[PDB]
């Protein structure tokens, strides 16, 4: 029954099994790289949080529009995804979470608008419908902050007109080296970020503001939000790498099982062919 | 631009006309096969009478 075809198929499967092991090897290394890249963005955000907190606490005259909770009529979503598949069920779970959240927001009679990052999200929510405001594609592994200013700028501009009231960030969280969890967190209505700091330990000195404090506060807030978005994208990149590693290991195991099944089938067919050949030879010999 | 809107609204008239045309064609095409089988069975019963 053309046993050489089965032998070739088994060889090709065993070759693909080697192919996937190396892809797992590489995905682990990039997960390490993105994991240590997540750490380098911490001091910038820490310093900005400290400065903003001190400025807002020392000058409580006015409240900025990003720090006050106004009634909600429309919300927004910044959805980050990967550009290519073969990474577990990362995007599917994230999209299920955001869809459920949107359905929950629908009963409140508040409609939604989107800003998509990554090819998978673009396709999924172009087929889903909805009210898209911007799209971005081919982010890469180490995005430059310039590539991300478009979506956040569009969302913030829509917020400044009163069109939007909340803007949620939808991404994945890096729990450990093997597990990822979806997340839906608001960012524009800045939740007080440890504002209890520097009230008991605050000193009796203020800065010397070269511009008026209002403009300085606005400039600080915009950059702080952009940095939050960037370091939320980097963590999603790391989660994608971990998911791809896990998926490649699972594929290697499944190929290893396929080999063990095809070997049994091949052996059975080989014995059957030998028996048939011998039977025919003996019959032809006895008939002469 | 609302004149352009009336152009839109007439388009729907064409679509309705086309669907009505197809409905007529189908509902009266089916009668043809009705007639076909009626003549077949009439011939068949005549066949039993003539074979008797």
């Amino acid at each position: 029954a053309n046993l050489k075809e089965i032998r070739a198929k088994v060889a090709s499967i065993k070759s693909t099994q080697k192919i996937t092991r190396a892809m797992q090897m590489v995905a682990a290394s990039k997960m390490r790289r993105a994991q240590e890249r997540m750490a380098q963005g911490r001091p910038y955000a820490d310093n900005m949080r400290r400065v903003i907190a001190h400025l807002v606490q020392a000058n409580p005259e006015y409240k900025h529009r990003y720090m006050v909770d106004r009634p909600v009529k429309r919300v927004g979503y910044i959805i980050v995804s990967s550009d290519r598949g073969l990474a577990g069920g990362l995007n599917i779970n994230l999209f299920k979470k955001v869809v459920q959240h949107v359905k929950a927001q629908q009963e409140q009679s508040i409609e939604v608008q989107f800003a998509l990052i990554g090819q998978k999200a673009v396709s999924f929510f172009k087929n889903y419908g909805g009210k898209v405001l911007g799209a971005t594609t081919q982010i890469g592994d180490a995005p430059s902050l310039e590539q991300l200013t478009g979506s956040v700028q569009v969302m913030l501009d829509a917020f400044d007109k009163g069109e939007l009231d909340r803007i949620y960030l939808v991404s994945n969280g890096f729990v450990n080296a093997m597990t990822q969890k979806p997340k839906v967190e608001q960012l524009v209505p800045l939740a007080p970020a440890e504002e209890g700091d520097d009230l008991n330990r605050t000193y009796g000195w203020d800065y010397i503001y070269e511009p008026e404090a209002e403009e300085l506060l606005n400039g600080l807030l915009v950059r702080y939000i952009e940095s939050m978005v960037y370091q939320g994208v980097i963590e999603n990149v790391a989660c994608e790498q971990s998911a791809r590693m896990v998926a490649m290991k699972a594929a290697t195991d499944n190929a290893g099982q396929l080999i063990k099944d095809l070997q049994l089938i091949y052996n059975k067919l080989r014995q059957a062919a030998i028996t048939q050949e011998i039977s025919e030879i003996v019959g032809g010999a006895a008939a002469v | 631009d609302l004149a352009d809107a009336q152009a839109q609204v007439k388009q729907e008239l064409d679509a309705a006309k086309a669907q009505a045309a197809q409905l007529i064609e189908q509902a009266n095409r089916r009668a043809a096969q009705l007639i076909e089988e009626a003549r077949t069975q009439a011939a068949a019963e005549g066949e039993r009478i003539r074979q008797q």
């Binding site: 029954a1 053309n2 290519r84 598949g85 396709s123 025919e280 019959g283 032809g284 008939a287 002469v288 | 679509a15 086309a18 669907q19 197809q22």
Partner: protein
């Protein structure tokens, strides 16, 4: 003409060729043979159908179906049923071939369909084994190849000189012919067995019918990847010969990359368009049973597919589109349809008329 949009465009059959129909059980071989017999209503070629090793109820049903369509007025049925002795099942194809050859040697055309040559081979194996002749592979006698060869080699086309000599000057002008459609059945698509390997070597082509394609809805289940016809383009009318290139290349492209069919989301635009067109052309090849197409219908459908007039209709609705288009042409454009059917020409006038009709259909019909 067989009447199938796939066979007549991709595996053509000429007069005098010997085309094999091979495939697993219950895939539509007998249906294809009977449709080929039915489609010959107006070509004026006599048919002969030989049934070997079939229960008499199936033979009676086939005869009744041929009588209902009026195709029995020019057909002869030779029946060697399953209860008949092995000698009759061994001799039936030859006695059918003689009745066919009566017409070949006198200027007229004939078409003979051997049903289940595998059962003739089985009957001859039973006869040879009981006579104590030595067996070969699979217990068949050594000379099964010579059994099938001297049967299939009689189907041919003879020149006007031969027929003039045979009739002593009565039929001077014309030339004879005889076409064969042997049918083989394979076990689990194993075409490396003895009898199918012998038969494939002799015939001028084959038409593979697949089970997996049959269940999936593609009926007939003709497999275009491995079906060939060595006569090729010379056995087609001018218009279908000119038009079949687009169908052939579309199926070739759709078949090269069928391994990625489920991954259309992750691909570039060119290959996605190739898939979009290949799926549509594959959907075009579906056809009902007992209803054959004249060459004009095939020409119109294939032209409408070639020039991208099907590119804007969803895949689930292509069959209805095609049927409505053919009916629309049958109604509005009878003279053009008869012009194409009668001759088969293909000029600028014909192409312009076809394109105008297709455009008016898309504009004003709404299938």
């Amino acid at each position: 003409q067989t009447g199938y949009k796939s066979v007549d465009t991709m595996i053509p059959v000429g007069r005098g060729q010997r085309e094999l129909i091979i495939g697993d059980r219950q895939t539509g071989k007998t249906a294809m043979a009977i449709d080929a017999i039915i489609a010959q209503k107006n070509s004026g070629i006599k048919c002969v159908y030989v049934a070997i090793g079939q229960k008499q109820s199936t033979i009676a049903n086939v005869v009744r179906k041929l009588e209902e369509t009026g195709a029995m007025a020019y057909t002869t049925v030779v029946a060697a049923a399953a209860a008949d002795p092995a000698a009759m099942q061994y001799l039936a194809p030859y006695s059918g071939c003689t009745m066919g050859e009566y017409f070949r040697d006198r200027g007229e055309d004939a078409l003979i369909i051997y049903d289940d040559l595998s059962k003739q081979a089985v009957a001859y194996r039973q006869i040879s084994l009981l006579l104590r002749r030595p067996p070969g592979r699979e217990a068949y006698p050594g000379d099964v190849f010579y059994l099938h060869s001297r049967l299939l080699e009689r189907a041919s086309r003879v020149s006007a000189e031969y027929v003039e000599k045979f009739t002593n000057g009565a039929v001077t002008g014309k030339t004879g012919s005889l076409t064969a459609l042997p049918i083989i059945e394979t076990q689990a698509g194993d075409v490396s067995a003895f009898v199918p390997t012998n038969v494939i070597s002799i015939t001028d082509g084959q038409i593979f019918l697949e089970t997996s394609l049959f269940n999936a809805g593609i009926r007939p289940a003709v497999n275009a990847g491995i079906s060939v016809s060595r006569v090729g383009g010379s056995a087609q009318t001018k218009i279908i010969k000119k038009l079949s290139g687009g169908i052939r290349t579309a199926l070739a492209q759709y078949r090269e990359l069928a391994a990625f069919a489920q991954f259309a989301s992750d691909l570039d635009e060119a290959t996605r368009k190739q898939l979009e067109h290949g799926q549509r052309v594959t959907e075009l090849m579906k056809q009902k049973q007992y209803a054959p197409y004249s060459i004009a219908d095939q020409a119109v459908s294939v032209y409408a597919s070639n020039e991208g007039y099907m590119a804007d209709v969803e895949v689930k609705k292509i069959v209805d589109f095609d049927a409505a288009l053919i009916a629309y042409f049958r109604s509005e454009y009878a003279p053009l349809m008869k012009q194409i059917d009668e001759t088969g020409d293909y000029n600028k006038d014909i192409e312009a008329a076809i394109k105008a009709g297709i455009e008016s259909f898309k504009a004003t019909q709404t299938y």
